[PDB]
Design a protein around this ligand. Structure first.
Ligand SMILES: CC(=O)N[C@@H]1[C@@H](O)[C@H](O)[C@@H](CO)O[C@H]1O
Ligand SMILES: CC(=O)N[C@@H]1[C@@H](O)[C@H](O)[C@@H](CO)O[C@H]1O
Ligand SMILES: CC(=O)N[C@@H]1[C@@H](O)[C@H](O)[C@@H](CO)O[C@H]1O
Ligand SMILES: CC(=O)N[C@@H]1[C@@H](O)[C@H](O)[C@@H](CO)O[C@H]1O
Ligand SMILES: CC(=O)N[C@@H]1[C@@H](O)[C@H](O)[C@@H](CO)O[C@H]1O
Ligand SMILES: CC(=O)N[C@@H]1[C@@H](O)[C@H](O)[C@@H](CO)O[C@H]1O
Ligand SMILES: *[C@@H]1O[C@H](CO)[C@@H](O)[C@H](O)[C@H]1NC(C)=O
Ligand SMILES: *[C@@H]1O[C@H](CO)[C@@H](O)[C@H](O)[C@H]1NC(C)=O
Ligand SMILES: *[C@@H]1O[C@H](CO)[C@@H](O)[C@H](O)[C@H]1NC(C)=O
Ligand SMILES: *[C@@H]1O[C@H](CO)[C@@H](O)[C@H](O)[C@H]1NC(C)=O
Ligand SMILES: *[C@@H]1O[C@H](CO)[C@@H](O)[C@H](O)[C@H]1NC(C)=O
Ligand SMILES: *[C@@H]1O[C@H](CO)[C@@H](O)[C@H](O)[C@H]1NC(C)=O
Ligand SMILES: *[C@@H]1O[C@H](CO)[C@@H](O)[C@H](O)[C@H]1NC(C)=O
Ligand SMILES: *[C@@H]1O[C@H](CO)[C@@H](O)[C@H](O)[C@H]1NC(C)=O
Lengths: 196, 110, 196, 110, 196, 110, 196, 110, 196, 110, 196, 110
């Protein structure tokens, strides 16, 4: 229980999802467009994934988890949903999160947002969001999702688990347009190609 | 985490118990109550009610209270059972950041 | 808005076109004949493309654009049309342009033209043309085209945008023969193979 | 940028407002007016009119003015609506460089 | 008789089996999941095999045997059976055994068990079991089995032998749940792919 | 290594002769007798008999002795011939380790 | 006009032909027998082509042309026709020519001819012929031919031009047998494989 | 460069105007006249006429002159129109080098 | 006659056979199991071939022969027949022989036999046998065989010869079991794959 | 090397002329005579005759001599022609090594 | 005429043949068995070809020829015929020849014959024959054969010539058996595979 | 190099003119005359005639001379025309080496 395996690749997964609503146009999934990198050596989990037009850099502080895999998909009205699968959970402490989204195509720019999100669903964790560019309209982050993560349940060999306790789920949200709650839903034309 | 039961064609109440640790005011906040289908039920924009996106079936039956922070839904139905959310947004000049959310599932006489 | 992405390849395009009327003979498109190179490190966008019998070297000063891609085609009466797709437009300031056309086949020679073109359509921009050789009869350059750049709309994955504001278009022209205005039109037997 | 409307079978005028910042003379400039099909309408070569390429239907109906720089087309028709261009070339000893252009769209009574 | 061949690969086999009952989930055999390493240079036979979710390190002290081959399979109720084939038996002395089971996936941890197993079936040999992690519920070890080791009897070219003298078999057991004797049986849906 | 023969419909005795070199007590040990099909026959948990998993046909016919460490099975049948095991476990706080095992094959008149 | 392109390969061609009547036997074209080398760095165009049984080394002095390509063929009575295509003609000055024919197979030897050919057709150009060996009977050279150089008119992508002015053609001839004028004619079973 | 026209069934003359800059003699030169089909017409080998390869139809109709260097062909025909060549060779001990050539096209009454 | 060719491979063969009766189990021929090495530099012909479970090392002293090739086969009752083909015979002197058989699989051990065999068939030659291990029951050696060495007579290209003079044949034998004379006969299910 | 001829249904003698340079004794030697089919004829183990593997057809017809080292076979038949071997083995404590062999071919009247 | 080409490979051939009657056995041609090497740098032509069982080393002194190609064939009664094709003949001087035949398989040995053959057919040339081994019974050598050298007339591209003047043919012969004149004839089952 | 013609059924003579520069004797030489089919005609081994391989049709009709070195063949036939060879071999102790050869073609009346 004390240690994470620190292996090459994992068969056992977990869940944590987010969605970014961008203004420029993306039609559909490309099946191999994403490229992701992961790190844990710092005692803080970090995952940097470059996708369709933006790079997402997520950091969990005091985690005991290392991001095993990820998936990305494009839905209706130019929404990019990213699922992140970590190794396994050992304790319930409501880890903090730091997310930075950089526009690397068609709307590059400097910093436009550096505030922090309270997440008063339980009011124990805070997520610090930094946005570079103007290619963002909605940002939603659900930690410990309770929905059906298994897409095409299931991949050939991987095993997937998901939290079933309501007390652990966390919701962080930031919108710049008018009333964009529930930026999009999971079960749709979203293809969800593996991210790597 | 909140289970509410109502008698057949009884009255429904949706509270979400905003702690309001920052002692904020209704003039700088927006509130939404939405069902499981994403259809809006009511909106209190910076202290004034709005009826810009409510579905027709939800029109009029809603009533908002200031001190109680509870929405009163009337004329319940057998098919109105479901989950409702209390989304509170803070309207900063830069953007709106979600500062509270509460789920509540309601069912009627079977 | 401030920064251009500075990536490897771009899914996002734009528009700027030109046509060269040469005297020697070109039959039809070869599908792989062109070869182009691009540069921005100078703060001035530059694109040098060698094609059927001439090398074209174009430079935009104070641009905030880098030539993403280009296409070349041959029409009737030995006209070579070149379309140029840049990253994206950030401001409307009517950049200047410098174009040099060198005859590398069948009509080589020294400099024969070094004047500048006023373009008094709005009379705010000036394009300087330098021609080496005798393999040129017409030279037309349309900046910010309003016609239908999307050819075979559209390429497999790329996205193409085009200016729709009449005030930003510019037309530069130079002719040596008699009244060669409108050297040719886009939608024809022009094949337009991608230039690279 | 210039929209011209005329009554049914009225007279049509196509100006293009050459600023002429250099105070040049017609003896060194050529002027062409052409439609959306690339058929010529009139040409003023270095001060004298020329009728070397005008289509037959466009013959005679055109008239050119010195001070106004406007072409007066007569006998409008239902099918003559379209875009006309005012292309001015400077005839240097080396080559001709385009120094002015102006679009004008004309439509008739519907 | 005095010397073991000390070759590259062997056609002649033997028997010694074990079974590990783990709590996390294993569906079926993967046909190439295992990877094994063997050593004898110390005068003590050692075999370390990394499999589905754990690494097993077994050492025979004063052996005169070098582990030639191995096979691993997954049965019902998340059981992992490992058969080990050694070169050949020269003497009957009831060798001691040291077994270390390390959870390398989904249940890592520190040491949770370091005791020794008496095996009073004859009470002449002792096995020392060290378990790192929490991914173990049953541990059974049969030295010199008398059951039918030949699976798909027999492999293409190998020859297999097994002890037929009841006095040499040894049984070591350790359970953490309630009454888990006979953690599983050989002839089942067990695929038993060769371990290498 | 222990062959037991019984006359037709005779009584059966299964001993396993636990040496008990450590001079342990029945309060910290469990004993199980099982057949070739893995069905249990009896269980002595820390000194108290338990009948939580014995098959109906095996119920009642078994009896356990303290000093002799022998299980007495009655009402033998033609189909009861087979192998029985004497598995002894030690219940330490951490886990249970098998500290003794003894096989015995029994057959009846044929 | 002043400069030749000095490229790798050319699509534009020209004409100049010659025919060598050799005594030993050649059956038919071999489709890949020739091998040519070209040079201009000296301001004198030089082409050295090794073919069926001899090496031909031709040099034009004060040329402004570089031999772009060549073709060789075998006809009746053991005749070898070589066509040479240059870049393009810039001026009319009736260049000189130096031709050396070396027998590299079946008739090797030392120098047997070093005289010069006047070509008094216009009497302005002089060709110096050096023949090593005895493997030559006729030698004819037509500069700026007016016949149909295009063989299989025309090659897949190349463009071909030919002089149409009578005053530029020149004829050089040397015979060792009796009255071998018009050593052969173009349109025959001559295959004319490209020379490289 | 030399076009010769003759009246119907007139007499034909083929000159080629050898400049003779070196002031050579007929004893060291040969002259051949050939048509477009490569058939010979006459030959003056080192000053003496030869009739070893002339085609039968060409026999007799040819006559050679000394000072004029012109070949006189008689009995013209409709099908005799074509190109004729004046090939002069210098007979050195080593080989013969072509020192002069002249084309001439002749046609008859149409 | 004096010199042997000392080539790479020989089309010319000869004969000399032996049979080893081993106790452990061999099923059938494997068609590629053997591997043999040859040496002559010492003036003594030596052939060391490793086969199914034993390595055979044979040496002829004062031979004028180098072992060109060999073949191995397995028959009934676990017999291993080895045929050896040498270059050619130059003289009749009844060479001596040294044979060493080492058990490299399933019966390894130290030396168990170091005596010499008289071979009083003519009583002129002596063969010294050294056996390491316990994997041997019969040992027969026939020098200059008179039987039909050609197996599948004959191989694709090789030429095979055999002694036809009775006075040159020699038989060496050693048995540990009871009356194992004629350990087996040539023409049987013996496959006799080429040994290399 | 030894050809023996016998009259029809005559007596057969098989000697093999053991030189015995070591002056060894029969108490340490075994002798076998076998035909071309590997069927044994007689065995003298350490000085005593044995009949443990002889084929039935060869029983009784054989007789062994001490001084002559010759086997006498009686009741010859047309089908008994063939080759016979005189294999001598030395029974050392470790193993038996062949010390002498002799071939003899016999044929009968035909 | 003075110089030989000194090329890589030649299309033009010539003729000179020989036949060796060996005692050991050769069945038929192997189609690729021969391997030949050639040299001229010494001013004396030399060809060394290793074939079925013997190496032939031929030297022509003061030759002006270099051996271009060769062919070998096997006929009836174990005869090996070798044809040798040289570049071309410039003079008629009856070159001398030195031939050495070495047995490299099945009959090796030291020198057995070192005499010279007079060839008094014209009595102008002498051939020095050296034989190593005993694998030779007949030796015939025909220089400038007048028979039909073209075998399968003719090879794909090579041109073949042969002397037609009876005065130049030379015949050298040496036999060790009884009356072996005309050791064999060309047109037979002789396959004559190219020698290289 | 030697062509011999004979009248119809005339006598045939085959000489080959051995120079014999070494003044050798018939006792150390052998002579063969063979036809175009490789069949032998005569042999003079070391001075004495031999008839060991002559074909039947060639028997008797041959005759050898000492001084003239000429073979006299009689009874010519129409089908006997062909080429004959005079092969002279030297019988050294090591081997025989050819020291002279001469071809001669003969034809008869046709
Ligand atoms: C500004 C802020 O958010 N601070 C909290 C910090 O007090 C807490 O210890 C940590 C662990 O959850 O999370 C963060
Ligand atoms: C000669 C000329 O063209 N000068 C202009 C310059 O005045 C202007 O500031 C610049 C910016 O577009 O463009 C250029
Ligand atoms: C604690 C323990 O198990 N000790 C024994 C030791 O006495 C014995 O010599 C060895 C050989 O089997 O095995 C172990
Ligand atoms: C010997 C000879 O040929 N000389 C001429 C030379 O007079 C002339 O100036 C040059 C240019 O064509 O060509 C050469
Ligand atoms: C002990 C023994 O065998 N010695 C002989 C030796 O006398 C003989 O010279 C040699 C040649 O075969 O063979 C061996
Ligand atoms: C011994 C012998 O054969 N000598 C001759 C030699 O006299 C002659 O000069 C040479 C040229 O063919 O050939 C050789
Ligand atoms: C990701 O963010 C962390 C801090 O949140 C930063 O240290 C790191 O450099 C970022 N990754 C990249 C690739 O810039
Ligand atoms: C493993 O089994 C579970 C249920 O037993 C199933 O849901 C899952 O898809 C399986 N995965 C694989 C890789 O077999
Ligand atoms: C993307 O979608 C637009 C319209 O939705 C279409 O015009 C374009 O061709 C599409 N491109 C790709 C690569 O899917
Ligand atoms: C070898 O033979 C035995 C029985 O003779 C058989 O059981 C085994 O499967 C065989 N193995 C091989 C590899 O041939
Ligand atoms: C180019 O066109 C010309 C005529 O238009 C034609 O003769 C030539 O063959 C063409 N060549 C190629 C490569 O298209
Ligand atoms: C060679 O020929 C012999 C008999 O002519 C034959 O026995 C042998 O198999 C042949 N071998 C080959 C390789 O042709
Ligand atoms: C061939 O013979 C020459 C002399 O005749 C000799 O010098 C040369 O070494 C020989 N070649 C080989 C490969 O031995
Ligand atoms: C060449 O031609 C000759 C006769 O024309 C013929 O005999 C020979 O086989 C030919 N060879 C090739 C390679 O074409």
């Amino acid at each position: 229980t004390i240690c994470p395996p620190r292996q090459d690749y994992r068969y056992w997964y977990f869940a944590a999802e987010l969605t970014i609503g961008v203004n420029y146009d993306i039609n559909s999934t490309i099946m191999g467009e994403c490229h992701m990198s992961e790190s844990y050596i710092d005692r803080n989990a970090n995952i940097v994934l470059t996708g369709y037009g933006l790079e997402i850099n997520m950091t969990i502080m005091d985690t005991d988890q290392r991001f095993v895999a990820a998936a990305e998909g494009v839905g209706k009205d130019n929404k990019l949903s990213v699922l992140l699968f970590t190794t396994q959970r050992l304790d319930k402490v409501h880890h903090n999160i730091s997310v930075t989204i950089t526009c690397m195509e068609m709307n590059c720019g400097t910093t436009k947002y550096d505030s922090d999100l309270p997440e008063s669903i339980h009011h124990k964790s805070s997520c610090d969001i930094t946005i570079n560019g103007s290619c963002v309209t909605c940002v939603n982050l659900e930690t410990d999702p309770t929905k059906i993560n298994p897409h095409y349940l299931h991949p050939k060999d991987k095993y997937l688990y998901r939290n079933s306790e309501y007390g652990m789920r966390g919701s962080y949200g930031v919108t710049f347009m008018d009333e964009l709650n529930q930026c999009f839903l999971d079960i749709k034309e979203v293809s969800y190609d593996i991210c790597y | 985490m909140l289970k509410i039961q109502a008698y057949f064609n009884e009255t429904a109440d949706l509270p979400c118990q905003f702690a309001n640790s920052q002692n904020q005011s209704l003039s700088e906040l927006v509130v939404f109550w939405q069902d499981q289908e994403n259809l809006v039920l009511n909106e209190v924009y910076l202290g004034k009610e709005k009826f810009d996106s409510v579905h027709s079936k939800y029109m009029g039956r809603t009533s908002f209270d200031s001190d109680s922070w509870t929405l009163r839904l009337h004329n319940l139905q057998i098919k109105d059972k479901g989950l409702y959310q209390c989304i509170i947004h803070h309207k900063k000049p830069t953007g709106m950041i979600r500062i509270h959310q509460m789920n509540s599932e309601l069912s009627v006489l079977a």
